[PDB]
Structures are given as C-alpha cells and as structure tokens.
Amino acid sequence: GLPPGPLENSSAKLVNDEAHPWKPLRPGDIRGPCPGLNTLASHGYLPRNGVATPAQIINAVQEGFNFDNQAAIFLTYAAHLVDGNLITDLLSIGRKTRLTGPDPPPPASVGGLNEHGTFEGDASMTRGDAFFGNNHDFNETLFEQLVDYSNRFGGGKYNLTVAGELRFKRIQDSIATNPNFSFVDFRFFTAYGETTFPANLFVDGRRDDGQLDMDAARSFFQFSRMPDDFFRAPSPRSGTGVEVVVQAHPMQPGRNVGKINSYTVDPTSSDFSTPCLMYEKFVNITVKSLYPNPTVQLRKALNTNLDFLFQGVAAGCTQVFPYGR
Ligand code: HEM
Ligand SMILES: COCCCCCCCCCCCC(=O)O
Ligand SMILES: *[C@@H]1O[C@H](CO)[C@@H](O)[C@H](O)[C@H]1NC(C)=O
Ligand SMILES: *[C@@H]1O[C@H](CO)[C@@H](O)[C@H](O)[C@H]1NC(C)=O
Ligand SMILES: *[C@@H]1O[C@H](CO)[C@@H](O)[C@H](O)[C@H]1NC(C)=O
Ligand SMILES: *[C@@H]1O[C@H](CO)[C@@H](O)[C@H](O)[C@H]1NC(C)=O
Ligand SMILES: *[C@@H]1O[C@H](CO)[C@@H](O)[C@H](O)[C@H]1NC(C)=O
Ligand SMILES: [Cl-]
Ligand SMILES: [Mg+2]
C-alpha cells in the first residue's frame, strides 16, 4: 500500500488508553532490538505477534509516539528492503520467522530487524553487539550503565547531554572488546539518531522537556510498556538534537580490522558531510547485494519500495535506480 501521510491531528494525547492496553508476550510473539516498535506491538498499535506491514509500522509510530512522517517513511522502507519480505509486504520487528511468508532466493536473508549488519548494528545502548551472542534482548548490565550515565550527566534523567556521553562510551567499549566492530554508512547515521529518540519520544508530551526519568526508561527499554497515563509528544519529531550528541565527541566512520583496538577510518564510508552518499550506498550496495538479479515480481516490488524509501530522503538528493526505471 502507499506510505501513510502525516497525522491530521498531532496534539499530545493519552496513548496508553482503553483501546491500547499493555499485554504480556504469548508464545510465538516476536520482540526485537527497537524499544519503540516493541512498545507499539505490546500495546496493540502494531499486531501483537510483532509481524507488520510497512504501512502498519508508519501508522503506529505516528499515532503512538508522534514520530514525524519523513523519518517514519525512511526508516520503515530501509528496514523492509533489507529485512522484510517484499512479495508478502511483511516485516518481523525481531527474529526471522516463517510468518513473513515464502523466502526469496539467497543472498537475500529476510532476517527481521534482528539481522546483524543490515539495519541493526554495534554500539547499541541497551543491547549487546552481535559478536557477543545477542543483538536484540534487553541487557540489565548495559541498562545500569545508562542509569549511571544519567546520574552523572543528567541529574538522574536521560537527556541529550547523557546521550552524547553514553553514545561515545558504547563506541569506545565496542572498539576495546569487539574485533569485528563496524561503524560505517547506515549504522553510523542511525546509531546517533537512536540516542535522541528516548529524550524526544519517551518523555510524556505534557512535559516534553527532553528529561526522561529512569522508571519510564526501564518500562520502555525492558518491558515494552508505556507508563500509566502516558501522553505522546505534542508535535511530530524524530532526531531533533542529534547535533548535540555528535558535538559531544565527533567520530569518523570506521571499523575494527579483525582485532580489538584497531579502529581504522573508512574513506569510502558516508558521514554527516555526505548524507546523500549514505542513501546512494544503501541502495547501490546494501539492497543490490541482497537482490543482484531479481526475477520480474521481485524487481517490481523492489522498485515500488525504493520509490517509497526516496519519499523519506531529505530534499536535495538525486534518486538512484539500481534496477532501471
Ligand atoms: C519508524 C520505524 C522504526 C524502525 C524501522 C526502527 C528500527 C530500529 C532498529 C532495527 C533498531 C536497532 C538498531 C541498533 O541499536 O542496533 C532500533 C533502535 C532503536 N529504536 Fe527504533 N525504529 C523505528 C522507530 C523508532 C521509534 C518511533 C522509537 C521511539 C519512539 C525508536 C526508538 C529506538 C531506540 C531508543 C533504539 C536504540 C536501542 C538501543 O540502542 O538500546 N525507534 N530501531
Ligand atoms: C542522524 O540520525 C539518523 C536517524 C534518522 C532519523 C531521521 C530520518 C530522516 C530521513 C532523512 C534522511 C536523509 C538521507 O538519508 O539522506
Ligand atoms: C486534536 O486532538 C486533541 C487531543 O486529542 C483535541 O483536544 C483537539 O481538540 C483536536 N483538534 C481538532 C482540530 O479537532
Ligand atoms: C562481522 O562484520 C561483518 C561486516 O564487516 C558482518 O557482515 C558480520 O555479520 C559481522 N558479524 C558479527 C557477529 O559481528
Ligand atoms: C550483557 O552485557 C554485559 C556487558 O557487555 C555482558 O558482559 C553480558 O554477557 C550481557 N548479557 C547478559 C545476558 O547480561
Ligand atoms: C541534562 O541534565 C543536566 C542536569 O540537570 C543538565 O546540566 C544538562 O543541561 C541537561 N541537558 C539537556 C540537553 O537538557
Ligand atoms: C549509484 O548508481 C547510480 C547509477 O545507477 C550512479 O549514478 C551513482 O553514482 C551510484 N552511486 C554510488 C555511490 O555508487
Ligand atoms: Cl509528520
Ligand atoms: Mg545493535
């Protein structure tokens, strides 16, 4: 279906309401590395089994959290192109599942949001790097480090100052312990944006002060659960304030080269100075590598989803056509 449009009414409102109660997981229910999508599934804004269409995901992030339209479209279609089933139009917000339908041929993985190196990546705040065995479950030790950074830099609350310090700490921990640490292109951009999301979207919209308390933080990050009487943000937003996070500790994109403490800058990677290059490489390299010679029905589904992806790209970039027009 077409990408949904922006909210007709984007006011703050109760989103933890009678029609969207929190429910525990049933056997087979899928939760993944994103506490935003996990919470919408656990409140019934998304299907509770954690398998959804792109249009369902865009509608849920807007209705439940007031995520802005352009960001919703870009992230949803990027995730769907690399992790979703383009024929059935279904994406798992977590582990690979037969529930997304019959698979395309390799090398396409349709691995859900849990698939390492497509969307999900290293130096997550409350999830471990895939090298350590689990890139998707809430990690109590990592969350306690988020609390400690909130106590030291946020007076007990998570804010953009905390995000700047913790983002850099998680990069330095990955450099020191993960010999396969990768921090380039798509992951380089999304890792910085994700650290603003709690301050911009998990803060009750009646305050919208960018100060997230640790009870609310645990409720979202561990339990996929809105605080009692949670109001969504009072206007559409996503990564507002990412400039503060970067400015705290500016980093070049790069990777460890098979050893710890070997972080090597990648001059071929995009960075914040080349945002159009990030889009071009995502399409010409990442998507194309998963579908190099697609059959007629797959080509048509790719071209449709790539057009939808381009709707979320900031004005100024040129659309690229890996399968022709
Ligand atoms: C619009 C579609 C969305 C998609 C496809 C999506 C997908 C993802 C994925 C795959 C990750 C894991 C990346 C990683 O850390 O390795 C992630 C992280 C995250 N997402 Fe989402 N996301 C979306 C929207 C949102 C929204 C609306 C929120 C908040 C309301 C949110 C909050 C977060 C946070 C806080 C993290 C970082 C988790 C951590 O580092 O511990 N996301 N997202
Ligand atoms: C800096 O964090 C990035 C997280 C993305 C959140 C806002 C997505 C907005 C989509 C425009 C992207 C333009 C482009 O890709 O060239
Ligand atoms: C929009 O929704 C809010 C809160 O749900 C409501 O109070 C407000 O009156 C609505 N605006 C319009 C134009 O209906
Ligand atoms: C190691 O890094 C490569 C890309 O550089 C990635 O494709 C692979 O999945 C990574 N594996 C783990 C578990 O970190
Ligand atoms: C959580 O993260 C810590 C710190 O990286 C790690 O040592 C531990 O094995 C991870 N997993 C669990 C289940 O705690
Ligand atoms: C984070 O909280 C601390 C302590 O209240 C404060 O000094 C800092 O200005 C806050 N940062 C932001 C961006 O709100
Ligand atoms: C992407 O491919 C198009 C041709 O299809 C080309 O114009 C563009 O330069 C490519 N960009 C990159 C970064 O490879
Ligand atoms: Cl919007
Ligand atoms: Mg990760």
Separation CA 202–CA 217 (nearest Å): 7
Which value in Å is the resolution of this experimental model?
Answer: 1.9
What range does the domain containing 244 cover? 1-325
Can you say whether the dihedral through the CA atoms of 246, 251, 252, 257 is positive or negative? negative
Q: What's the gap in Å between 183 CA and the centre of ligand 2?
A: 16
Among the listed residues 290, 319, 298, 297, the one whose alpha carbon sits nearest the alpha carbon of residue 82:
290
Which residue puts its alpha carbon closest to atom 9 of ligand 2? 71
Among the listed residues 227, 252, 255, the one whose alpha carbon sits nearest the alpha carbon of residue 16:
227
Which experimental method was this entry solved with?
X-ray
User: Is the distance from CB of 83 to CB of 112 less than 8 angstroms?
Assistant: yes
Ligand 4 pocket: which residues have CB below 6 Å? 116-117, 130-131, 180, 182
Among the listed residues 194, 53, 212, 31, the one whose alpha carbon sits nearest the alpha carbon of residue 40:
31
Residue with tokens 């449709």, as numbered in its chain: 304
Q: What's the gap in Å between 34 CA and the centre of ligand 9?
A: 9
Q: Which ligand minimizes its atom distance to the CA of 185?
A: 2
Region for residue 89 given its phi and psi (left: phi exceeds 0; alpha: psi -120 to 50; beta: otherwise): left
309 three-class SS:
helix
Region for residue 272 given its phi and psi (left: phi exceeds 0; alpha: psi -120 to 50; beta: otherwise): alpha
User: Is the distance from CB of 83 to CB of 92 less than 8 angstroms?
Assistant: yes
The single-letter code of the amino acid at 310 is: F
Q: What's the gap in Å between 125 CA and the centre of ligand 6?
A: 19
Report the number of distinct structural domains present in the chain: 1
Annotated binding site for heme: 34
Q: Is the CB of 120 under 6 A from ligand 1?
A: yes
Separation CA 281–CA 278 (nearest Å): 5
Q: What's the gap in Å between 8 CA and the centre of ligand 1?
A: 24
Residue to substitute in 180, 184, 255 for testing ligand 4 pocket (most ligand atoms within 8 angstroms of CB): 180
Q: Report the first-to-last Cα separation within the chain, whole angstroms.
A: 20
| 145: its two tokens | 């480090």
Separation CA 265–CA 250 (nearest Å): 13
